[PDB]
Amino acid sequence: NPIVFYDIATRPPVEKTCCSPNPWKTRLALNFKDLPYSTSWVALTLPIIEDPATDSLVGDSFDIAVYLQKTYPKSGAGDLFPPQSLDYVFKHNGILVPLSEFPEYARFNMNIDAAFTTHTQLTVQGFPFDPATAEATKAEFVRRGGVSCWDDFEQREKMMDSFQNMLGDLAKLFLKDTSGPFLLGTKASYADLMIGAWLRMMHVTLPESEWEEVRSWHEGIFGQLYDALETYAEVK
């Protein structure tokens, strides 16, 4: 009967260390819809859910969210995709790197992901490796960062500044409606969950001092959103 949710295994206790942003989008969306599910943890394509109520097996976070909205439009906090103009572009996308239902939400998903992934080198020193996939995951972080060895990972302050710069651009979107902490003020959307999932990754992996900075910059807009999303952050 209940949905089965496949997530990426991290160091014990997984309930506190789990930090993959795309699975966290689906976790937030499942909690937002208030749906019964249990998590299966997978060691090193995810997230995937299986819904026995429709005999469906759906992969990819965005497509899971569409499925959840089409199948359970009225469950939980209601609509995952309220109409809105998510007028945001990650200007550092470029035009050469090679690349849909709710197109405004789909484009926002891709810009948010690009925005946050370009700063994930800050997360390296704090990543909660599954000891069984640790040497392999480090190898992947090394191949994908363009460094020669794990040890290659002042210049941190520079990185934090760029991160803060990006967050300032994104914060402006939250100033369109200051009646609540979400993009639509008091009404939450899957676009909030998109950002919240990356905030969870940073909260788990950054030095507490740097999480505090992220949390408080630009009038604490992201700290407020993080706190506001806690009601959907149950690890179940």
JSON list of C-alpha atoms in Angstrom, two decimals:
[
{"chain": "A", "resi": 1, "resn": "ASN", "atom": "CA", "xyz": [0.00, 0.00, 0.00]},
{"chain": "A", "resi": 2, "resn": "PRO", "atom": "CA", "xyz": [2.53, 2.72, 0.98]},
{"chain": "A", "resi": 3, "resn": "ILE", "atom": "CA", "xyz": [4.93, 4.37, -1.44]},
{"chain": "A", "resi": 4, "resn": "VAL", "atom": "CA", "xyz": [8.53, 3.11, -1.46]},
{"chain": "A", "resi": 5, "resn": "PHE", "atom": "CA", "xyz": [11.13, 5.89, -1.77]},
{"chain": "A", "resi": 6, "resn": "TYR", "atom": "CA", "xyz": [14.70, 5.11, -2.84]},
{"chain": "A", "resi": 7, "resn": "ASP", "atom": "CA", "xyz": [17.32, 7.51, -1.45]},
{"chain": "A", "resi": 8, "resn": "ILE", "atom": "CA", "xyz": [21.12, 7.71, -1.35]},
{"chain": "A", "resi": 9, "resn": "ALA", "atom": "CA", "xyz": [22.75, 6.07, 1.68]},
{"chain": "A", "resi": 10, "resn": "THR", "atom": "CA", "xyz": [25.05, 8.29, 3.79]},
{"chain": "A", "resi": 11, "resn": "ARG", "atom": "CA", "xyz": [27.04, 7.74, 6.99]},
{"chain": "A", "resi": 12, "resn": "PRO", "atom": "CA", "xyz": [25.04, 6.58, 10.04]},
{"chain": "A", "resi": 13, "resn": "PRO", "atom": "CA", "xyz": [22.75, 7.93, 11.39]},
{"chain": "A", "resi": 14, "resn": "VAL", "atom": "CA", "xyz": [21.32, 8.27, 7.88]},
{"chain": "A", "resi": 15, "resn": "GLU", "atom": "CA", "xyz": [18.27, 10.13, 9.24]},
{"chain": "A", "resi": 16, "resn": "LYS", "atom": "CA", "xyz": [20.54, 13.06, 10.18]},
{"chain": "A", "resi": 17, "resn": "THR", "atom": "CA", "xyz": [23.25, 12.82, 7.52]},
{"chain": "A", "resi": 18, "resn": "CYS", "atom": "CA", "xyz": [21.17, 12.20, 4.36]},
{"chain": "A", "resi": 19, "resn": "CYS", "atom": "CA", "xyz": [22.01, 15.10, 2.11]},
{"chain": "A", "resi": 20, "resn": "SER", "atom": "CA", "xyz": [21.49, 14.42, -1.65]},
{"chain": "A", "resi": 21, "resn": "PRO", "atom": "CA", "xyz": [19.57, 17.43, -3.04]},
{"chain": "A", "resi": 22, "resn": "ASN", "atom": "CA", "xyz": [17.45, 15.66, -5.67]},
{"chain": "A", "resi": 23, "resn": "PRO", "atom": "CA", "xyz": [16.19, 12.94, -3.30]},
{"chain": "A", "resi": 24, "resn": "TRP", "atom": "CA", "xyz": [15.51, 15.69, -0.76]},
{"chain": "A", "resi": 25, "resn": "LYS", "atom": "CA", "xyz": [13.22, 17.43, -3.30]},
{"chain": "A", "resi": 26, "resn": "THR", "atom": "CA", "xyz": [11.12, 14.25, -3.50]},
{"chain": "A", "resi": 27, "resn": "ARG", "atom": "CA", "xyz": [11.17, 13.79, 0.29]},
{"chain": "A", "resi": 28, "resn": "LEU", "atom": "CA", "xyz": [9.92, 17.35, 0.74]},
{"chain": "A", "resi": 29, "resn": "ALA", "atom": "CA", "xyz": [7.25, 16.78, -1.93]},
{"chain": "A", "resi": 30, "resn": "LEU", "atom": "CA", "xyz": [6.08, 13.52, -0.33]},
{"chain": "A", "resi": 31, "resn": "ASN", "atom": "CA", "xyz": [5.84, 15.17, 3.10]},
{"chain": "A", "resi": 32, "resn": "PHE", "atom": "CA", "xyz": [4.15, 18.21, 1.55]},
{"chain": "A", "resi": 33, "resn": "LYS", "atom": "CA", "xyz": [1.48, 15.92, 0.09]},
{"chain": "A", "resi": 34, "resn": "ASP", "atom": "CA", "xyz": [1.47, 14.15, 3.52]},
{"chain": "A", "resi": 35, "resn": "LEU", "atom": "CA", "xyz": [1.66, 10.73, 1.91]},
{"chain": "A", "resi": 36, "resn": "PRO", "atom": "CA", "xyz": [2.43, 7.38, 3.54]},
{"chain": "A", "resi": 37, "resn": "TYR", "atom": "CA", "xyz": [5.86, 6.16, 2.44]},
{"chain": "A", "resi": 38, "resn": "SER", "atom": "CA", "xyz": [8.95, 4.42, 3.76]},
{"chain": "A", "resi": 39, "resn": "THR", "atom": "CA", "xyz": [12.53, 4.99, 2.64]},
{"chain": "A", "resi": 40, "resn": "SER", "atom": "CA", "xyz": [14.90, 2.37, 1.29]},
{"chain": "A", "resi": 41, "resn": "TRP", "atom": "CA", "xyz": [18.52, 3.53, 1.40]},
{"chain": "A", "resi": 42, "resn": "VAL", "atom": "CA", "xyz": [20.68, 2.72, -1.63]},
{"chain": "A", "resi": 43, "resn": "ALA", "atom": "CA", "xyz": [24.49, 2.73, -1.64]},
{"chain": "A", "resi": 44, "resn": "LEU", "atom": "CA", "xyz": [25.82, 4.68, -4.68]},
{"chain": "A", "resi": 45, "resn": "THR", "atom": "CA", "xyz": [19.46, 7.65, -11.24]},
{"chain": "A", "resi": 46, "resn": "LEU", "atom": "CA", "xyz": [18.05, 8.34, -7.76]},
{"chain": "A", "resi": 47, "resn": "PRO", "atom": "CA", "xyz": [15.45, 9.34, -6.46]},
{"chain": "A", "resi": 48, "resn": "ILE", "atom": "CA", "xyz": [12.98, 6.61, -7.48]},
{"chain": "A", "resi": 49, "resn": "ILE", "atom": "CA", "xyz": [9.54, 5.94, -6.02]},
{"chain": "A", "resi": 50, "resn": "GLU", "atom": "CA", "xyz": [7.20, 2.99, -6.38]},
{"chain": "A", "resi": 51, "resn": "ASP", "atom": "CA", "xyz": [3.50, 3.67, -5.85]},
{"chain": "A", "resi": 52, "resn": "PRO", "atom": "CA", "xyz": [1.51, 0.43, -5.34]},
{"chain": "A", "resi": 53, "resn": "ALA", "atom": "CA", "xyz": [-1.76, 2.38, -5.69]},
{"chain": "A", "resi": 54, "resn": "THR", "atom": "CA", "xyz": [-1.06, 2.79, -9.42]},
{"chain": "A", "resi": 55, "resn": "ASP", "atom": "CA", "xyz": [1.66, 0.12, -9.90]},
{"chain": "A", "resi": 56, "resn": "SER", "atom": "CA", "xyz": [3.98, 2.87, -11.08]},
{"chain": "A", "resi": 57, "resn": "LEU", "atom": "CA", "xyz": [7.74, 3.14, -10.86]},
{"chain": "A", "resi": 58, "resn": "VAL", "atom": "CA", "xyz": [8.81, 6.76, -11.45]},
{"chain": "A", "resi": 59, "resn": "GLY", "atom": "CA", "xyz": [12.37, 8.07, -11.50]},
{"chain": "A", "resi": 60, "resn": "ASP", "atom": "CA", "xyz": [13.76, 11.63, -11.53]},
{"chain": "A", "resi": 61, "resn": "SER", "atom": "CA", "xyz": [12.78, 14.22, -8.91]},
{"chain": "A", "resi": 62, "resn": "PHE", "atom": "CA", "xyz": [10.92, 16.59, -11.24]},
{"chain": "A", "resi": 63, "resn": "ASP", "atom": "CA", "xyz": [8.91, 13.78, -12.84]},
{"chain": "A", "resi": 64, "resn": "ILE", "atom": "CA", "xyz": [8.10, 12.31, -9.41]},
{"chain": "A", "resi": 65, "resn": "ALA", "atom": "CA", "xyz": [6.77, 15.72, -8.36]},
{"chain": "A", "resi": 66, "resn": "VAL", "atom": "CA", "xyz": [4.60, 15.92, -11.50]},
{"chain": "A", "resi": 67, "resn": "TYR", "atom": "CA", "xyz": [3.33, 12.39, -10.83]},
{"chain": "A", "resi": 68, "resn": "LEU", "atom": "CA", "xyz": [2.50, 13.28, -7.21]},
{"chain": "A", "resi": 69, "resn": "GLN", "atom": "CA", "xyz": [0.63, 16.40, -8.31]},
{"chain": "A", "resi": 70, "resn": "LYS", "atom": "CA", "xyz": [-1.30, 14.65, -11.08]},
{"chain": "A", "resi": 71, "resn": "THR", "atom": "CA", "xyz": [-2.18, 11.62, -8.93]},
{"chain": "A", "resi": 72, "resn": "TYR", "atom": "CA", "xyz": [-2.84, 13.32, -5.56]},
{"chain": "A", "resi": 73, "resn": "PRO", "atom": "CA", "xyz": [-3.66, 16.93, -6.51]},
{"chain": "A", "resi": 74, "resn": "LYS", "atom": "CA", "xyz": [-5.60, 17.59, -3.32]},
{"chain": "A", "resi": 75, "resn": "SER", "atom": "CA", "xyz": [-3.56, 15.70, -0.70]},
{"chain": "A", "resi": 76, "resn": "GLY", "atom": "CA", "xyz": [-1.61, 17.38, 2.09]},
{"chain": "A", "resi": 77, "resn": "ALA", "atom": "CA", "xyz": [-0.74, 21.05, 1.61]},
{"chain": "A", "resi": 78, "resn": "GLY", "atom": "CA", "xyz": [-2.49, 20.83, -1.78]},
{"chain": "A", "resi": 79, "resn": "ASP", "atom": "CA", "xyz": [-1.05, 22.08, -5.04]},
{"chain": "A", "resi": 80, "resn": "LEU", "atom": "CA", "xyz": [2.64, 21.57, -5.75]},
{"chain": "A", "resi": 81, "resn": "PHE", "atom": "CA", "xyz": [2.55, 23.74, -8.89]},
{"chain": "A", "resi": 82, "resn": "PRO", "atom": "CA", "xyz": [0.51, 26.89, -8.28]},
{"chain": "A", "resi": 83, "resn": "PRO", "atom": "CA", "xyz": [0.80, 29.29, -11.25]},
{"chain": "A", "resi": 84, "resn": "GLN", "atom": "CA", "xyz": [3.58, 31.83, -10.79]},
{"chain": "A", "resi": 85, "resn": "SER", "atom": "CA", "xyz": [6.27, 33.66, -12.75]},
{"chain": "A", "resi": 86, "resn": "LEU", "atom": "CA", "xyz": [9.58, 32.23, -11.54]},
{"chain": "A", "resi": 87, "resn": "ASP", "atom": "CA", "xyz": [11.64, 34.93, -13.26]},
{"chain": "A", "resi": 88, "resn": "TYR", "atom": "CA", "xyz": [15.11, 33.62, -12.48]},
{"chain": "A", "resi": 89, "resn": "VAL", "atom": "CA", "xyz": [18.07, 32.81, -14.71]},
{"chain": "A", "resi": 90, "resn": "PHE", "atom": "CA", "xyz": [21.41, 31.47, -13.57]},
{"chain": "A", "resi": 91, "resn": "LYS", "atom": "CA", "xyz": [23.46, 33.79, -15.77]},
{"chain": "A", "resi": 92, "resn": "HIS", "atom": "CA", "xyz": [26.50, 31.48, -15.45]},
{"chain": "A", "resi": 93, "resn": "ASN", "atom": "CA", "xyz": [24.70, 28.74, -17.39]},
{"chain": "A", "resi": 94, "resn": "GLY", "atom": "CA", "xyz": [26.23, 29.66, -20.72]},
{"chain": "A", "resi": 95, "resn": "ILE", "atom": "CA", "xyz": [25.03, 28.48, -24.10]},
{"chain": "A", "resi": 96, "resn": "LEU", "atom": "CA", "xyz": [27.38, 25.67, -25.15]},
{"chain": "A", "resi": 97, "resn": "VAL", "atom": "CA", "xyz": [27.01, 23.02, -22.40]},
{"chain": "A", "resi": 98, "resn": "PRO", "atom": "CA", "xyz": [24.36, 20.61, -23.78]},
{"chain": "A", "resi": 99, "resn": "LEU", "atom": "CA", "xyz": [21.10, 20.22, -21.86]},
{"chain": "A", "resi": 100, "resn": "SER", "atom": "CA", "xyz": [7.79, 19.80, -20.38]},
{"chain": "A", "resi": 101, "resn": "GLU", "atom": "CA", "xyz": [4.47, 19.93, -18.45]},
{"chain": "A", "resi": 102, "resn": "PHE", "atom": "CA", "xyz": [5.07, 22.75, -15.96]},
{"chain": "A", "resi": 103, "resn": "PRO", "atom": "CA", "xyz": [7.68, 24.59, -18.06]},
{"chain": "A", "resi": 104, "resn": "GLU", "atom": "CA", "xyz": [8.19, 27.53, -15.69]},
{"chain": "A", "resi": 105, "resn": "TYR", "atom": "CA", "xyz": [8.76, 25.12, -12.79]},
{"chain": "A", "resi": 106, "resn": "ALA", "atom": "CA", "xyz": [10.95, 22.92, -15.01]},
{"chain": "A", "resi": 107, "resn": "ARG", "atom": "CA", "xyz": [13.21, 25.82, -16.05]},
{"chain": "A", "resi": 108, "resn": "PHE", "atom": "CA", "xyz": [13.46, 27.04, -12.44]},
{"chain": "A", "resi": 109, "resn": "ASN", "atom": "CA", "xyz": [14.52, 23.52, -11.37]},
{"chain": "A", "resi": 110, "resn": "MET", "atom": "CA", "xyz": [17.34, 23.61, -13.87]},
{"chain": "A", "resi": 111, "resn": "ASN", "atom": "CA", "xyz": [18.56, 27.11, -12.95]},
{"chain": "A", "resi": 112, "resn": "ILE", "atom": "CA", "xyz": [18.44, 26.43, -9.19]},
{"chain": "A", "resi": 113, "resn": "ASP", "atom": "CA", "xyz": [20.41, 23.21, -9.69]},
{"chain": "A", "resi": 114, "resn": "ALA", "atom": "CA", "xyz": [23.00, 25.02, -11.81]},
{"chain": "A", "resi": 115, "resn": "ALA", "atom": "CA", "xyz": [23.16, 27.87, -9.28]},
{"chain": "A", "resi": 116, "resn": "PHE", "atom": "CA", "xyz": [23.83, 25.59, -6.34]},
{"chain": "A", "resi": 117, "resn": "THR", "atom": "CA", "xyz": [26.00, 22.92, -7.96]},
{"chain": "A", "resi": 118, "resn": "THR", "atom": "CA", "xyz": [28.67, 25.45, -8.97]},
{"chain": "A", "resi": 119, "resn": "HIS", "atom": "CA", "xyz": [29.28, 26.02, -5.24]},
{"chain": "A", "resi": 120, "resn": "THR", "atom": "CA", "xyz": [29.30, 22.39, -4.06]},
{"chain": "A", "resi": 121, "resn": "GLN", "atom": "CA", "xyz": [33.09, 22.37, -3.60]},
{"chain": "A", "resi": 122, "resn": "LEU", "atom": "CA", "xyz": [32.32, 24.02, -0.25]},
{"chain": "A", "resi": 123, "resn": "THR", "atom": "CA", "xyz": [30.56, 20.81, 0.82]},
{"chain": "A", "resi": 124, "resn": "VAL", "atom": "CA", "xyz": [33.50, 18.47, 0.23]},
{"chain": "A", "resi": 125, "resn": "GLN", "atom": "CA", "xyz": [35.18, 18.63, 3.65]},
{"chain": "A", "resi": 126, "resn": "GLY", "atom": "CA", "xyz": [31.89, 17.88, 5.42]},
{"chain": "A", "resi": 127, "resn": "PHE", "atom": "CA", "xyz": [30.30, 15.25, 3.20]},
{"chain": "A", "resi": 128, "resn": "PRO", "atom": "CA", "xyz": [28.92, 12.26, 5.25]},
{"chain": "A", "resi": 129, "resn": "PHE", "atom": "CA", "xyz": [30.28, 9.42, 3.14]},
{"chain": "A", "resi": 130, "resn": "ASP", "atom": "CA", "xyz": [28.79, 5.97, 3.42]},
{"chain": "A", "resi": 131, "resn": "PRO", "atom": "CA", "xyz": [31.90, 4.03, 4.54]},
{"chain": "A", "resi": 132, "resn": "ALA", "atom": "CA", "xyz": [31.02, 1.32, 1.98]},
{"chain": "A", "resi": 133, "resn": "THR", "atom": "CA", "xyz": [30.93, 3.78, -0.96]},
{"chain": "A", "resi": 134, "resn": "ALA", "atom": "CA", "xyz": [33.54, 6.22, 0.43]},
{"chain": "A", "resi": 135, "resn": "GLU", "atom": "CA", "xyz": [36.61, 5.53, -1.73]},
{"chain": "A", "resi": 136, "resn": "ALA", "atom": "CA", "xyz": [34.36, 5.32, -4.81]},
{"chain": "A", "resi": 137, "resn": "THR", "atom": "CA", "xyz": [32.41, 8.51, -4.06]},
{"chain": "A", "resi": 138, "resn": "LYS", "atom": "CA", "xyz": [35.63, 10.45, -3.39]},
{"chain": "A", "resi": 139, "resn": "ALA", "atom": "CA", "xyz": [36.93, 9.28, -6.77]},
{"chain": "A", "resi": 140, "resn": "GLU", "atom": "CA", "xyz": [33.78, 10.69, -8.42]},
{"chain": "A", "resi": 141, "resn": "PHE", "atom": "CA", "xyz": [34.08, 14.03, -6.58]},
{"chain": "A", "resi": 142, "resn": "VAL", "atom": "CA", "xyz": [37.69, 14.18, -7.78]},
{"chain": "A", "resi": 143, "resn": "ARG", "atom": "CA", "xyz": [36.93, 13.35, -11.43]},
{"chain": "A", "resi": 144, "resn": "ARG", "atom": "CA", "xyz": [34.11, 15.92, -11.49]},
{"chain": "A", "resi": 145, "resn": "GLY", "atom": "CA", "xyz": [35.90, 18.79, -9.75]},
{"chain": "A", "resi": 146, "resn": "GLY", "atom": "CA", "xyz": [38.89, 18.70, -12.06]},
{"chain": "A", "resi": 147, "resn": "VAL", "atom": "CA", "xyz": [41.32, 18.04, -9.22]},
{"chain": "A", "resi": 148, "resn": "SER", "atom": "CA", "xyz": [44.10, 15.44, -9.28]},
{"chain": "A", "resi": 149, "resn": "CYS", "atom": "CA", "xyz": [43.54, 13.72, -5.91]},
{"chain": "A", "resi": 150, "resn": "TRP", "atom": "CA", "xyz": [41.34, 13.90, -2.82]},
{"chain": "A", "resi": 151, "resn": "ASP", "atom": "CA", "xyz": [43.94, 16.03, -1.00]},
{"chain": "A", "resi": 152, "resn": "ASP", "atom": "CA", "xyz": [43.55, 18.76, -3.65]},
{"chain": "A", "resi": 153, "resn": "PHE", "atom": "CA", "xyz": [40.23, 19.70, -2.04]},
{"chain": "A", "resi": 154, "resn": "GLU", "atom": "CA", "xyz": [41.77, 32.36, 2.20]},
{"chain": "A", "resi": 155, "resn": "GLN", "atom": "CA", "xyz": [40.56, 30.75, -1.05]},
{"chain": "A", "resi": 156, "resn": "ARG", "atom": "CA", "xyz": [37.64, 29.35, 0.95]},
{"chain": "A", "resi": 157, "resn": "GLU", "atom": "CA", "xyz": [36.52, 32.89, 1.85]},
{"chain": "A", "resi": 158, "resn": "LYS", "atom": "CA", "xyz": [36.52, 33.62, -1.88]},
{"chain": "A", "resi": 159, "resn": "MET", "atom": "CA", "xyz": [34.28, 30.59, -2.47]},
{"chain": "A", "resi": 160, "resn": "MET", "atom": "CA", "xyz": [31.86, 31.68, 0.28]},
{"chain": "A", "resi": 161, "resn": "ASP", "atom": "CA", "xyz": [31.68, 35.14, -1.29]},
{"chain": "A", "resi": 162, "resn": "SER", "atom": "CA", "xyz": [30.67, 33.83, -4.71]},
{"chain": "A", "resi": 163, "resn": "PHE", "atom": "CA", "xyz": [28.10, 31.61, -2.99]},
{"chain": "A", "resi": 164, "resn": "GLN", "atom": "CA", "xyz": [26.75, 34.67, -1.14]},
{"chain": "A", "resi": 165, "resn": "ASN", "atom": "CA", "xyz": [26.64, 36.60, -4.42]},
{"chain": "A", "resi": 166, "resn": "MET", "atom": "CA", "xyz": [24.48, 33.92, -6.05]},
{"chain": "A", "resi": 167, "resn": "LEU", "atom": "CA", "xyz": [22.19, 33.79, -3.01]},
{"chain": "A", "resi": 168, "resn": "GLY", "atom": "CA", "xyz": [21.71, 37.56, -3.22]},
{"chain": "A", "resi": 169, "resn": "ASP", "atom": "CA", "xyz": [20.45, 37.26, -6.78]},
{"chain": "A", "resi": 170, "resn": "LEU", "atom": "CA", "xyz": [18.04, 34.51, -5.78]},
{"chain": "A", "resi": 171, "resn": "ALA", "atom": "CA", "xyz": [16.85, 36.33, -2.65]},
{"chain": "A", "resi": 172, "resn": "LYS", "atom": "CA", "xyz": [15.31, 39.10, -4.79]},
{"chain": "A", "resi": 173, "resn": "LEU", "atom": "CA", "xyz": [12.64, 36.64, -5.94]},
{"chain": "A", "resi": 174, "resn": "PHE", "atom": "CA", "xyz": [11.56, 36.24, -2.30]},
{"chain": "A", "resi": 175, "resn": "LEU", "atom": "CA", "xyz": [11.10, 40.01, -2.02]},
{"chain": "A", "resi": 176, "resn": "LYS", "atom": "CA", "xyz": [8.20, 40.02, -4.48]},
{"chain": "A", "resi": 177, "resn": "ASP", "atom": "CA", "xyz": [5.87, 38.86, -1.67]},
{"chain": "A", "resi": 178, "resn": "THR", "atom": "CA", "xyz": [7.11, 39.49, 1.88]},
{"chain": "A", "resi": 179, "resn": "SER", "atom": "CA", "xyz": [3.85, 38.39, 3.54]},
{"chain": "A", "resi": 180, "resn": "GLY", "atom": "CA", "xyz": [5.40, 34.97, 4.14]},
{"chain": "A", "resi": 181, "resn": "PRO", "atom": "CA", "xyz": [8.73, 33.18, 3.72]},
{"chain": "A", "resi": 182, "resn": "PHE", "atom": "CA", "xyz": [7.87, 31.37, 0.46]},
{"chain": "A", "resi": 183, "resn": "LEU", "atom": "CA", "xyz": [8.05, 32.58, -3.14]},
{"chain": "A", "resi": 184, "resn": "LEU", "atom": "CA", "xyz": [4.29, 33.15, -2.96]},
{"chain": "A", "resi": 185, "resn": "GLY", "atom": "CA", "xyz": [4.47, 34.53, 0.57]},
{"chain": "A", "resi": 186, "resn": "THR", "atom": "CA", "xyz": [2.44, 32.23, 2.81]},
{"chain": "A", "resi": 187, "resn": "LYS", "atom": "CA", "xyz": [1.74, 29.64, 0.07]},
{"chain": "A", "resi": 188, "resn": "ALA", "atom": "CA", "xyz": [4.52, 27.09, -0.44]},
{"chain": "A", "resi": 189, "resn": "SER", "atom": "CA", "xyz": [5.35, 25.62, -3.84]},
{"chain": "A", "resi": 190, "resn": "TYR", "atom": "CA", "xyz": [7.55, 22.90, -5.30]},
{"chain": "A", "resi": 191, "resn": "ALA", "atom": "CA", "xyz": [9.90, 25.74, -6.26]},
{"chain": "A", "resi": 192, "resn": "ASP", "atom": "CA", "xyz": [10.39, 26.42, -2.56]},
{"chain": "A", "resi": 193, "resn": "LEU", "atom": "CA", "xyz": [11.13, 22.73, -2.01]},
{"chain": "A", "resi": 194, "resn": "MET", "atom": "CA", "xyz": [13.72, 22.90, -4.82]},
{"chain": "A", "resi": 195, "resn": "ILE", "atom": "CA", "xyz": [15.69, 25.52, -2.90]},
{"chain": "A", "resi": 196, "resn": "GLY", "atom": "CA", "xyz": [14.99, 23.88, 0.46]},
{"chain": "A", "resi": 197, "resn": "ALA", "atom": "CA", "xyz": [16.56, 20.63, -0.73]},
{"chain": "A", "resi": 198, "resn": "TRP", "atom": "CA", "xyz": [19.82, 22.41, -1.51]},
{"chain": "A", "resi": 199, "resn": "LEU", "atom": "CA", "xyz": [19.68, 24.21, 1.85]},
{"chain": "A", "resi": 200, "resn": "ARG", "atom": "CA", "xyz": [19.43, 20.83, 3.58]},
{"chain": "A", "resi": 201, "resn": "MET", "atom": "CA", "xyz": [22.58, 19.67, 1.74]},
{"chain": "A", "resi": 202, "resn": "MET", "atom": "CA", "xyz": [24.45, 22.78, 2.89]},
{"chain": "A", "resi": 203, "resn": "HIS", "atom": "CA", "xyz": [23.19, 22.53, 6.48]},
{"chain": "A", "resi": 204, "resn": "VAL", "atom": "CA", "xyz": [24.51, 18.96, 6.67]},
{"chain": "A", "resi": 205, "resn": "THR", "atom": "CA", "xyz": [27.90, 19.52, 5.02]},
{"chain": "A", "resi": 206, "resn": "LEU", "atom": "CA", "xyz": [29.03, 23.08, 5.81]},
{"chain": "A", "resi": 207, "resn": "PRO", "atom": "CA", "xyz": [30.97, 24.20, 8.89]},
{"chain": "A", "resi": 208, "resn": "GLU", "atom": "CA", "xyz": [28.44, 25.46, 11.43]},
{"chain": "A", "resi": 209, "resn": "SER", "atom": "CA", "xyz": [29.98, 28.92, 11.16]},
{"chain": "A", "resi": 210, "resn": "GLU", "atom": "CA", "xyz": [29.40, 28.97, 7.40]},
{"chain": "A", "resi": 211, "resn": "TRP", "atom": "CA", "xyz": [25.88, 27.58, 7.67]},
{"chain": "A", "resi": 212, "resn": "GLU", "atom": "CA", "xyz": [25.23, 30.47, 10.04]},
{"chain": "A", "resi": 213, "resn": "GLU", "atom": "CA", "xyz": [26.46, 32.94, 7.41]},
{"chain": "A", "resi": 214, "resn": "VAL", "atom": "CA", "xyz": [24.32, 31.38, 4.67]},
{"chain": "A", "resi": 215, "resn": "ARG", "atom": "CA", "xyz": [21.45, 31.38, 7.15]},
{"chain": "A", "resi": 216, "resn": "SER", "atom": "CA", "xyz": [21.66, 35.09, 7.99]},
{"chain": "A", "resi": 217, "resn": "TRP", "atom": "CA", "xyz": [22.81, 36.94, 4.85]},
{"chain": "A", "resi": 218, "resn": "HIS", "atom": "CA", "xyz": [20.38, 38.99, 2.78]},
{"chain": "A", "resi": 219, "resn": "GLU", "atom": "CA", "xyz": [18.02, 39.55, 5.72]},
{"chain": "A", "resi": 220, "resn": "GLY", "atom": "CA", "xyz": [18.06, 35.87, 6.66]},
{"chain": "A", "resi": 221, "resn": "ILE", "atom": "CA", "xyz": [15.75, 35.00, 3.74]},
{"chain": "A", "resi": 222, "resn": "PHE", "atom": "CA", "xyz": [17.18, 31.51, 3.38]},
{"chain": "A", "resi": 223, "resn": "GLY", "atom": "CA", "xyz": [17.28, 30.83, 7.12]},
{"chain": "A", "resi": 224, "resn": "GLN", "atom": "CA", "xyz": [13.61, 31.81, 7.26]},
{"chain": "A", "resi": 225, "resn": "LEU", "atom": "CA", "xyz": [12.73, 29.51, 4.35]},
{"chain": "A", "resi": 226, "resn": "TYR", "atom": "CA", "xyz": [14.69, 26.64, 5.91]},
{"chain": "A", "resi": 227, "resn": "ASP", "atom": "CA", "xyz": [12.82, 27.07, 9.21]},
{"chain": "A", "resi": 228, "resn": "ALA", "atom": "CA", "xyz": [9.52, 27.33, 7.35]},
{"chain": "A", "resi": 229, "resn": "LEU", "atom": "CA", "xyz": [10.18, 24.07, 5.49]},
{"chain": "A", "resi": 230, "resn": "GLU", "atom": "CA", "xyz": [11.01, 22.08, 8.63]},
{"chain": "A", "resi": 231, "resn": "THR", "atom": "CA", "xyz": [7.32, 21.14, 8.85]},
{"chain": "A", "resi": 232, "resn": "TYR", "atom": "CA", "xyz": [7.98, 19.09, 5.64]},
{"chain": "A", "resi": 233, "resn": "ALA", "atom": "CA", "xyz": [11.43, 17.74, 6.56]},
{"chain": "A", "resi": 234, "resn": "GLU", "atom": "CA", "xyz": [10.45, 14.52, 8.35]},
{"chain": "A", "resi": 235, "resn": "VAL", "atom": "CA", "xyz": [12.88, 11.72, 7.49]},
{"chain": "A", "resi": 236, "resn": "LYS", "atom": "CA", "xyz": [10.48, 8.78, 7.39]}
]
